[PDB]
Structure formats: C-alpha cells, structure tokens
Amino acid sequence: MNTLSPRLRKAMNTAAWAHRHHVRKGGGIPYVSHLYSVMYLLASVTNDEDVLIAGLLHDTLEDVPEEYNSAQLEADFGPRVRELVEELTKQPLKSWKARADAYLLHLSAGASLEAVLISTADKLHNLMSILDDLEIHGEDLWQRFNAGKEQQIWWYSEVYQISLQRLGFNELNKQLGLCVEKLLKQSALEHHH
C-alpha cells in the first residue's frame, strides 16, 4: 500500500478543496467521498503514486475547472498526472450516447493501461453507489440521472468488458463484474413485480 507522502497529502487536500461545494447528483453528499473512494480502490491495485493522484483529481477539470484548471494541475503534480487526467476527458458532443460511444472506443484502443485502471475504479465506485441508492430509492432513482436503466446497464457492462480485455482479472475488474451482475438482478427484480 502506498505511503501517505507529502505529494499524496497535497492531492487529498487539493481534491477536497476544489470540490468543497461540489455535491454528488441526487443528494447532499460532498463529491470528495467519490474521489477518495476511487483513490482507495486504486491503492489496492497500484503502487504508482501518479495513478492515485490522477484518481483523486480525475474530475477536477470536467466538474470544477473554475476552482482547479490543467495548468494548476501540471504545476502542482507534473505533466504525467495531467496527461492521465486529460485522457479521461469527453468528446464535446450533444448526445449522451455519442459521448459514451467515443469514450468506450478510446478505452479499448488509445487510452493507456493507467487511464483504463482509473476509469475502472471510477465506474466501479459509481456502480457501487447506484446499487446502494437502489436499495434505498428503488426503481424511482433513475430520474436524477442523465441516462436511464437500460442505458446504464449497457454502459457498465461495456466498461466492464473493455476493462477486462485490457487489464485482465484484477481486484477492480472482479468487483466491477460482480456489480454488473447485481445490476442485472435488480432489473430482473423490477420486471418480476
């Protein structure tokens, strides 16, 4: 497990700071809970501090660029961390499915193995959170999201297949696959009613 170095402490502080008034969609839980969960998941599978730092700051440029920009990111953590975070950026397309399609194509060919790993921890924590919220809110939960039940099932299963083809059976892929099969039992439970 990586030690909490001054550079890793600085990244924890920066992620909490940049996302200080950022809250997760659907509730009042501060967004940093997701960023540290992603870092914690990555810590179990990598010893590369740049990967833990890019996991902490992967959403800064897309969600809070007014608080923390790419020049700030590079001056604080170097160009490899900036490159890592910038590989996960979306194509500026109107359509959700056109953005998802391009991200998936990049993940299968183009994205580095480190960017695929960060993306796997990110999607795994997002699916873990959806599963938690399904137990609380049921089938009514899909309203707070930009893509419905069948689009979500497609998204997570495609991310899982691509992640498994690129990285193999690591701890994040063993867990993401388990989550995908749980999401399918929840769609089965919805239809069973």
- Interface with a copy of itself (CB under 8 A): 1, 3-4, 6, 9-10, 12-13, 15-17, 20, 28-30, 32-33, 36-37, 40-41, 43-44, 125, 128-129, 132, 135, 175
Phi/psi of residue 172, each to 5°? -75, -40
Q: SS3 of 134, please?
A: helix
Question: CA-CA distance, 8 to 50, in Å (whole number)?
Answer: 9
Site for Mg ion in 20-79 (CB under 5 A): 59
Q: What is the largest CA-CA distance in the chain?
A: 55
Residue (89 or 185) nearer to Mg ion, CB: 89
Residue (68 or 103) nearer to a copy of itself, CB: 68
Residue (34 or 166) nearer to Mg ion, CB: 34
In the bound complex, which residue of the shown chain has the CB atom lying closest to Mg ion?
122
Residue 78 near which of Mg ion, a copy of itself, none (CB within 5-8 Å, type-dependent): none
Question: CA-CA distance, 31 to 100, in Å (whole number)?
Answer: 22
- Which of 30, 93, 106 minimizes the C-alpha distance to 63? 30
Residue 44, Cβ neighbours under 10 Å: how many? 12
The alpha-carbon radius of gyration of the chain (Å, integer) is 17
Q: Residue 87 interacts with Mg ion (CB under 5 A)?
A: no
58 has binding-site annotation: yes
Residue 153 near which of a copy of itself, Mg ion, none (CB within 5-8 Å, type-dependent): none
- Which of 142, 98, 41 minimizes the C-alpha distance to 58? 41
Minimum separation from the CB atom of position 122 to a copy of itself (A): 13
Q: Residue 122 interacts with Mg ion (CB under 5 A)?
A: yes
Binding-site residues, in ranges, read 34, 58-59, 122
User: Which residues lie near Mg ion (CB under 5 A)?
Assistant: 59, 122
